[PDB]
Structure 1
Amino acid sequence: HMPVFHTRTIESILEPVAQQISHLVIMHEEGEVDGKAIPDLTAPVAAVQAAVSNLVRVGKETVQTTEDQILKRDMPPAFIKVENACTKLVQAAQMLQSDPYSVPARDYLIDGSRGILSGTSDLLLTFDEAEVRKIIRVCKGILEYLTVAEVVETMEDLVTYTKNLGPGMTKMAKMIDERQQELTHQEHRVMLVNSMNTVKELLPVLISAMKIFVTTKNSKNQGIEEALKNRNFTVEKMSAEINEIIRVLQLTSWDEDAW
């Protein structure tokens, strides 16, 4: 009970039935709901059976398309779970069909419904993790390029650097913004927003520092030490914030084989 919904999307999908089931689990250990005859679900159940097959199909396709190795190994197991719990639901239906007061058939409905719900969540979680894993890479990439900042000594380089980092800094910003907007734990969202913003505010600051540097370089006018410090400090603080973001992201999207 009370799942770990990470994004609003998933929750808006699982929350409904997750409740219809939780409100029912309470109707067993302390109530044992049993009496009302259940009309043949040969139809309604069919509705789920069909959607389950469709789901499984898409997942099998998602595996072929995907490149993430964890997904190719985590999803397949989920397919079965949703398919297995579904055969149970379908059976529990024909059971009630012949006998609407069958108690055992009532059990098949619950166990099968929770199985389908759990099998689904696992599928969505896996997928989400892969998505997040895509962001971490992008983040790890920006981190790396910030390292090259200390190699730029000419305006020609500075121009190059800016044209490469800028686009990157945008993709990450886009991914981060589109991420926090889905997060459900207001706690993690604050860290992401503040971090990303701080990083966006430092970029222009980084460039300027580098510019001032390359300017002092080819110029009789001494005073270049303090320039390297500001540039270096920016990278350091920027890097800190990015490492912060990565971490917050890995809190739930991490697996033993994260390669």
Structure 2
Amino acid sequence: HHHHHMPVFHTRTIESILEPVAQQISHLVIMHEAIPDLTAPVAAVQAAVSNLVRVGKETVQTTEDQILKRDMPPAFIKVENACTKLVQAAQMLQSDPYSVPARDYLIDGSRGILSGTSDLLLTFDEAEVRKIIRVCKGILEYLTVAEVVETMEDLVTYTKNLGPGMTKMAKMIDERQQELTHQEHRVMLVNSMNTVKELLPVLISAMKIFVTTKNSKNQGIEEALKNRNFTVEKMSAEINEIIRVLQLTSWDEDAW
């Protein structure tokens, strides 16, 4: 009588790993059927989980990523706990193959393993996104340097630096949106990136005008400054929106 929900995974990669399990769990939940001796297959799951936990502990204990270090354990904890339910189920089924409580454990344990493994994969996914965010923040920081460019020589250096930086950022975003399952988020990323790319030449043009105006005589630089600053502000707004969107999740990603 309880309703359930199989996840719409966060990325295509996670989907390809976990979809089979989710589909098989759904099939068993919906099925109309005694259960055979599951001691051995459950033991194989137990062994796999133990290996995974061992590797997870090594990672937690060696990673310099303080955030990964903190978010990982709860996921492995959920997986281990769910595994204990499968073990209990197999033990119960040895004496009573028709046990209803045993079947309940099998289902809860299977779902808990799916949910814990998904949580685990999402923690590693978040670490990957943090790498993209770091690049975005480097661009925001470099945009603050525009105001210090006051010679044509420095403008050449600046453009030759910001240009490739934007290209790298754009590539990371393009690759990321291609991995996302949620269409709404992909659209936002692509739209913001396009806006940012379009503003780049506008910024360089504004900086060239500022440099030219400054290095002249009796010209007022107030307008050139304003126009440069306006463009930097718009670009920074767009990049912050990319950073915000890269971190969005969805309710439909939960399994229950």
TM-score norm. by structure 2 comes to 0.82
Could you tell me how far apart the structure 2 residues matched to 1:242 and 1:257 are?
A: 28
| Matched-pair contact (CA < 8 Å) for 1:21–1:114 | yes
Other structure's SS at 2:26 match? helix
Question: 1:129/1:43 Cα in 2 relative to 1: closer, same or farther (>3 Å)?
Answer: same
More deviation, 50-59/222-231 = 222-231
> Over residues 128-187 of structure 1, what are the superposed CA-to-partner deviations in whole Å (9 max), with x where a residue is unaligned?
223223322332231122111011001232233234423432332232122111111111
| Matched-pair contact (CA < 8 Å) for 1:14–1:117 | yes
More deviation, 95-104/172-181 = 95-104
Higher RCO (CA < 8 A, seq sep 6+)? 2
More deviation, 227-236/138-147 = 227-236
Could you tell me how far apart the structure 2 residues matched to 1:38 and 1:203 are?
A: 65
**How far is 1:84 from its partner?**
2.0
Other structure's SS at 1:243 match? helix
Matched, 1:18 2:22: yes
Could you tell me how far apart the structure 2 residues matched to 1:257 and 1:25 are?
A: 17
**How far is 1:27 from its partner?**
5.3
Over aligned residues, Cα RMSD in angstroms? 4.4
> Over residues 93-120 of structure 1, what are the superposed CA-to-partner deviations in whole Å (9 max), with x where a residue is unaligned?
2433454333332222112111111211
| Matched-pair contact (CA < 8 Å) for 1:130–1:253 | no
| Matched-pair contact (CA < 8 Å) for 1:70–1:257 | no
**How far is 1:193 from its partner?**
0.5
More deviation, 186-195/104-113 = 104-113
Could you tell me how far apart the structure 1 residues matched to 2:54 and 2:178 are?
A: 29
The residue that corresponds to 1:128 in the other structure is 125
**How far is 1:253 from its partner?**
10
**How far is 1:226 from its partner?**
4.5
Could you tell me how far apart the structure 2 residues matched to 1:212 and 1:18 are?
A: 59
**How far is 1:189 from its partner?**
0.6
| Matched-pair contact (CA < 8 Å) for 1:75–1:123 | yes
Could you tell me how far apart the structure 2 residues matched to 1:201 and 1:254 are?
A: 33
The residue that corresponds to 1:237 in the other structure is 234
Question: 1:56/1:162 Cα in 2 relative to 1: closer, same or farther (>3 Å)?
Answer: farther
**How far is 1:52 from its partner?**
2.0
Could you tell me how far apart the structure 2 residues matched to 1:224 and 1:256 are?
A: 53
Other structure's SS at 2:254 match? coil
Count of residues in Structure 1 that have an aligned counterpart in Structure 2: 252
**How far is 1:222 from its partner?**
4.4
- The percent identity for this pair of structures is 100
**How far is 1:257 from its partner?**
22
| Matched-pair contact (CA < 8 Å) for 1:41–1:93 | yes
